[PDB]
């Protein structure tokens, strides 16, 4: 049951936009809302509006009086001397709650005229006509106007609606909540050479009487919220999908072949999401818009998605196909379960984010294989356990503070830190995988189909929300639908992993009792760490003995420590028979390293990742080597690679080398075995016999049979030896000698890989392989032996580093004349120049990176150069570079770059709270408090980034370096 927090119900909204002026960055328009009051004596009506100048408001064609105030413009007063962050977080939460449409509130308060009170008490319709104007919007809707001359279509100027969550208040007045569903009528009067893309279906396109402008009329009969309404106006090249004909793809001019190749996969994503769920795609059209200077890499609205143009690749670009493919896939998953089925509160957001991430993981499983699915699930689980042990924990479904261990309030999406938002979505889809583990996948897809079917029977009624609230899901409704389809309720699993905000830590060690033939496990939990919680459920453990692989369920109550499980025979060591594996197959194992008295080959605690856990198991090194070689699970091979770094014995070198030589191993395991072999090789110097690690293996796999030092000409058509070939010198360059100087045998090998590179014969580009070669050249740089702080000149230039510097100069200059993809070689060469500057080789001068961080460059070059400037101002304690970065945060045209500068200055801070630095003035405290209070008031993501930066630099209490 859904009861509105608003005293009115909104039925229909007309959004008309005229006069989109690109020179002056200005729109004019009106908005006409059709509300039905649910309570008599409605009097004031409270709507949401930011940055719009409200000209006049007429209610039922009668002139009404409005008052506007935004408490989130300046959160605390300018003349308050408070400088602690808990004060700002409480004031910011109160300010966002005072404009919240999820309460009854709002920023624009319109007073109903007196003569309509007899029209409002007996509950009859009210039609509110506001007309407004955006004069020059800061972060409302982004105007990308290039400075080439010509007409606005000839120079490539466009507008798009940017922002996250409820940010539609930034460009027209609305009820900007996800729970106020209404039908829509959208008119946009644009230039005749431009096209206006929006939500709904385009019913017509009429000309103006001078035929210089045309009006696009859109209609949206599926009741969506105001927060799902978008807009993209530009000189877009239109491409109808040749497979599905209601899907149109819009790109920027001159990028039509890239659009043709890139969006050619999307019909398979549509077919997948419509056959695992049994509902068809709910909207009547689908539109993909590719734009410049995007807010996020992929945004999903109702019947529309806005991607950045940096996803567009051609047919000869690999290492970008899978990333763009999965961006399209998660946009479509959010089309199904973020835009059609919406949220009922700010709680129950974990339901929608979990269903979106879970069905996108099912797509990844079918498309890229179960092994890529397991690797992705393991990397997300490692991400969450790192974040939750780092700071507190992520609390899905809080109850309204519920989480007081962090520095922000979790009551609203616009007060969350961006890393918390990312980890929120990550934990939501892993908890949905856990619900699939308890209640099987076909029942899970039946739950999702029942939600979609209730929403689509709701979506066709005309009753103003008598039935339109069946399109809003809640937690209680989701659990009730689960209990309807399965008969089991998941309330212990919901109580543990949703309502409780923690992950578990397992420390395991075993001992084999030879007398009674048992395996005595010893599993203890660390439940006193700040991020942890105590697990009391069951726990699966998989033991591989000589007779095969056996699963055991252990009951781990609070007082439990020793778990005795039984062991089988050892009669497959009496005769040589094959040892049967986890799957149905069996292999020949070399049992010379195994103990004579124990049959068990390896043990895995929680193999299926059925809890949110971090396992620290103490096996013997031969058990880790057997688990690396003969396991049929990629997460166990990865964890054995990760645990073999502590055992540098030559049997582990043989194990990793046999993994590296082995095709029919998953390629991301071999790419990890490269770096593990490099670390082991660095640890057993003065024992290593022959050549450096992986060199003979590289010449055996990727070089000519007649010439060992000449590499084969590039043929990248295998896509697994391409990735292994481009990752093996990067790990080979980490080879550390006894003198701590990289062997001139590996550096010469990398330089010969660079010289003899011929790419005139493959059908794929070479930009990522050459960029990884520059990364391998940067990995070989050891710190220089400066004497008496000698000024770095050409007289003291290392003879090794002169070759590296010549190569990166040649590569960067050739990129200036012939570029590649993603400007990968510019990014790699800027990263390598920063590596050479971090050691004492090149003079520590930020002027090159400051010239590459200007506005007109590509955004990857910009963020690489700004990462170099952030690293410089951390190491050299530069005041003027920090003022340069803070000025660039305040006034840069691209807001993604501002968010990225705040993000990088949070990750690599110039000082922490423990450090005494010269940069801890009262002036810097006043600048960052002014940046939290004012200055970042227009983005909701810069303000949370400024809160994160103030927390990283000065902590939760009063800045110490202050009177």
């Amino acid at each position: 049951g859904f009861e509105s927090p608003r005293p009115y119900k909104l039925t229909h909204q007309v959004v008309c936009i005229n006069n989109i002026n690109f020179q002056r960055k200005s729109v004019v328009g009106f908005v006409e809302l059709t509300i039905f009051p649910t309570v008599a004596n409605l009097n004031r009506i409270k709507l949401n509006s930011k940055q719009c100048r409200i000209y006049r408001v007429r209610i039922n064609d009668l002139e009404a009086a409005f008052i506007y105030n935004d408490p989130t413009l300046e959160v605390c007063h300018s003349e308050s001397k408070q400088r602690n962050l808990n004060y700002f977080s409480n004031a910011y939460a109160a300010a966002v709650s005072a404009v919240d449409p999820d309460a009854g509130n709002g920023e624009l308060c319109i007073k109903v005229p007196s003569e309509l009170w007899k029209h409002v008490d007996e509950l009859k319709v009210l039609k509110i006509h506001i007309n407004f104007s955006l004069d020059q919007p800061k972060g409302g809707l982004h105007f990308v106007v290039p400075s080439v001359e010509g007409s606005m279509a000839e120079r490539g100027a466009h507008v798009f609606s940017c922002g996250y969550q409820n940010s539609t208040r930034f460009w027209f007045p609305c009820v900007d909540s996800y729970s106020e569903l209404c039908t829509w009528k959208l008119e946009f009067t644009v230039d005749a050479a431009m096209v206006a893309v929006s939500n709904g279906d385009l019913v017509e396109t009429v000309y103006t009487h001078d035929m210089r402008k045309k009006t696009f009329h859109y209609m949206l009969t599926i009741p969506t919220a105001a927060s799902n309404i978008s807009l993209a106006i530009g000189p877009f090249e239109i491409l109808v999908d040749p497979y599905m004909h209601e899907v149109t793809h819009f790109c920027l001019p001159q990028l039509l072949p890239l659009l043709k190749h890139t969006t050619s996969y999307l019909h398979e994503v549509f077919e997948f999401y419509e056959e695992i769920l049994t509902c068809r795609y709910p909207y009547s059209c689908f539109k993909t818009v590719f734009i410049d200077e995007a807010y996020v890499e992929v945004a999903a609205y109702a019947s529309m998605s806005i991607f950045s143009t940096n996803l567009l690749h051609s047919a000869m670009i690999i290492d970008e196909t899978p990333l763009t493919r999965r961006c399209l896939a998660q946009s479509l998953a959010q089309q199904f379960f973020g835009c059609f089925i919406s949220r009922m509160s700010w709680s129950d957001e974990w339901v929608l984010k979990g269903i979106s991430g879970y069905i996108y993981g099912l797509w990844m499983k079918k498309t890229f294989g179960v092994n890529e699915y397991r690797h992705w699930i393991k990397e997300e689980l490692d991400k969450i356990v790192a974040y939750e042990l780092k700071t507190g924990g992520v609390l899905l479904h809080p109850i309204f503070n519920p989480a007081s261990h962090l520095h922000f309030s979790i009551k609203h999406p616009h007060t969350l830190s961006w890393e918390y938002y990312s980890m929120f979505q990550c934990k939501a889809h892993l908890v949905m995988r856990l619900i699939e583990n308890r209640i099987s996948m076909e029942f899970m897809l039946q739950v999702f189909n029942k939600l979609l079917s209730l929403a689509s029977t709701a979506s066709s009624q005309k009753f103003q929300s008598h039935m339109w609230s069946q399109m809003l899901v809640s937690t209680s409704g989701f659990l009730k639908s689960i209990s309807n389809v399965s008969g089991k309720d998941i309330q212990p699993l919901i109580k543990q992993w949703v309502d409780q905000s923690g992950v578990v830590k397992f420390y395991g060690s075993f001992a084999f009792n030879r007398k009674r033939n048992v395996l005595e496990l010893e599993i203890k939990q660390d439940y006193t760490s700040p991020g942890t919680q105590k697990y009391v459920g069951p726990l699966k453990v998989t033991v591989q003995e000589l007779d095969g692989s056996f699963n055991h369920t252990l009951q781990i109550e609070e007082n439990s420590l020793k778990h005795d499980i039984p062991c089988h025979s050892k009669s497959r060591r009496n005769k040589k028979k094959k040892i049967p594996l986890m799957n149905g197959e069996e292999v020949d194992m070399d049992l010379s390293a195994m103990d004579a008295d124990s049959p068990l080959l390896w043990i895995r605690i929680d193999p299926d990742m059925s809890v949110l856990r971090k396992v620290e198991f103490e096996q013997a090194d031969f058990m880790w080597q057997y688990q690396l070689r003969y396991e049929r699970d990629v997460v166990a091979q990865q964890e054995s690679i990760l645990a073999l770094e502590k055992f540098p014995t030559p049997a582990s070198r043989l194990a990793l080398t046999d993994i590296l030589e082995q095709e029919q191993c998953f390629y991301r395991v071999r790419m990890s075995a490269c770096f593990c072999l490099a670390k082991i090789a660095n640890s057993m110097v003065s024992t290593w016999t022959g050549p450096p690690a992986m060199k003979s293996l590289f010449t055996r796999m990727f070089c000519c049979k007649s010439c060992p030092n000449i590499v084969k000409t590039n043929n990248f058509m295998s896509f697994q030896s391409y990735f292994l070939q481009k990752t093996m010198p990067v790990a080979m360059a980490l080879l550390r000698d006894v003198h701590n100087l990289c062997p001139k045998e590996v550096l010469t090998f990398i330089l010969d890989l660079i010289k003899y590179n011929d790419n005139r014969k493959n059908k794929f580009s070479d930009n990522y392989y050459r960029a990884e070669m520059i990364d391998a050249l940067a990995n070989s740089v050891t710190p220089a032996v400066s004497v008496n702080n000698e000024v770095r000149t050409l007289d003291n230039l290392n003879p090794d580093v002169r070759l590296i510097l010549e190569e990166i100069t040649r590569f960067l200059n050739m990129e200036k004349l012939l570029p590649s993809y993603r400007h990968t070689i510019t990014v790699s060469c800027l990263r390598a120049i920063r590596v050479l500057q971090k050691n004492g080789h090149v003079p520590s001068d930020p002027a090159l990176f400051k010239s590459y961080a200007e506005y007109g460059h590509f955004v990857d070059i910009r963020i690489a150069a700004l990462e170099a400037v952030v690293d410089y101002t951390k190491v050299d304690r530069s005041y003027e570079e920090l003022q340069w970065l803070l000025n660039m945060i305040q006034n840069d045209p691209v807001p993604y770059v501002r968010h990225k500068i705040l993000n990088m200055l949070t990750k690599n801070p110039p000082f922490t709270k423990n450090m005494e630095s010269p940069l801890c003035n009262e002036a810097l405290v006043d600048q960052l408090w002014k940046l939290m209070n004012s200055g970042t008031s227009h983005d909701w993501r810069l303000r949370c980034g400024a809160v994160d930066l103030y927390f990283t630099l000065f902590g939760l209490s009063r800045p110490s370096c202050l009177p």
Partner: peptide, 25 residues
């Protein structure tokens, strides 16, 4: 300037066009 000269880093207008686009196809 004689030894190791670097071409100076020049600002463009649309950097994604010179980054992402392939030149030999």
């Amino acid at each position: 300037v004689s030894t190791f000269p670097l071409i100076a880093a020049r600002p463009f207008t649309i950097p994604y066009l010179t980054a992402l686009l392939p030149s030999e196809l």
